[PDB]
Design a protein around this ligand. Structure first.
Ligand SMILES: NS(=O)(=O)c1cc(C(=O)NCCO)c(SC2CCCCC2)cc1Cl
Ligand SMILES: [Zn+2]
Length: 258
């Protein structure tokens, strides 16, 4: 039946329902750090999350989303490679069954334990659903996670996961500050790509930070206790919910640094 990450419905099957899976600007990609060229014309990124209003956390059967009120200009991304203003709508993660895999992007073929995606939509198109129909509709800030020291700012998310164990469960999640998930440096790579989940639309400017954040083994172990299945169905741990790297094709990855 429906797409997922399992034995029979995972990434290698998605093209049959979503032929753009084999398109010309698919994500994620391996970032070859020696080939990415420093681009002096990029700007510092502007991440303005001071007025971010979180509302709720949802297990959607693929990952979990932390949702924001995007009905006004509050939490916005701009600058860097972007023109105009992009509003935060949600964040989620991809992660592995073991610490040696889980990220979607890779760096010189290195896999991180997990990757955080902060999803934003371009306010010139009025709403998220119109934005995903445009080549410059979305901007995703991607952040790698390695296992080491705990990330204090992640603990509020970790502790609510037992309340949204299974697909379709949600919980109130107000007053969460996403600034606590950022690394110290905003040095980044950028390229034109796609959603990494069906429908795989080619509507995303990717901005991938170079500096990972560190989370503890105990924090990532709580992610791995979530379930892909619904309540009362046989348990399928939510692990390995990442799409592998796709062909770069006719694209350049640009560096904001060096
Ligand atoms: N992994 S990613 O490329 O950052 C990305 C993921 C999703 C997303 O939440 N996917 C889960 C299955 O729908 C969404 S929202 C989703 C996709 C379009 C229709 C609305 C649901 C947007 C992005 Cl950019
Ligand atoms: Zn994602």
């Amino acid at each position: 039946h429906h797409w997922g990450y399992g034995k029979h419905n995972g990434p290698e099957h998605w093209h049959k329902d979503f032929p753009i899976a084999k398109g010309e600007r698919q994500s994620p990609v391996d970032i070859d750090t020696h080939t990415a060229k420093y681009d002096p014309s990029l700007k510092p990124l502007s991440v303005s999350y001071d007025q971010a209003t979180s509302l709720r956390i949802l297990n959607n059967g693929h990952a979990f989303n932390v949702e924001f009120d995007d009905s006004q200009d509050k939490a916005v991304l701009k600058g860097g490679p972007l023109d105009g203003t992009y509003r935060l709508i949600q964040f989620h993660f991809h992660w592995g069954s073991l610490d040696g895999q889980g990220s979607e992007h890779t760096v010189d073929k290195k896999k991180y334990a997990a990757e955080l995606h902060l999803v934003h939509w371009n306010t010139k198109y009025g709403d998220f659903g119109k934005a995903v129909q445009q080549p410059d509709g979305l901007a995703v800030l991607g952040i790698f996670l390695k296992v080491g020291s705990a990330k204090p700012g992640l603990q509020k998310v970790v502790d609510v996961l037992d309340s949204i164990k299974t697909k379709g469960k949600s919980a109130d999640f107000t007053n969460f500050d996403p600034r606590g998930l950022l690394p110290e440096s905003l040095d980044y790579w950028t390229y034109p790509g796609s959603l990494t989940t069906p429908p795989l639309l080619e509507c995303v400017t990717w901005i991938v930070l170079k500096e990972p954040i560190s989370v503890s083994s105990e924090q990532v172990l709580k992610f791995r206790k979530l379930n892909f299945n619904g309540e009362g169905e046989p348990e399928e741990l939510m692990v390995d919910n990442w799409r592998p790297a796709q062909p770069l094709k006719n694209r350049q990855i640009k560096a904001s640094f060096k």
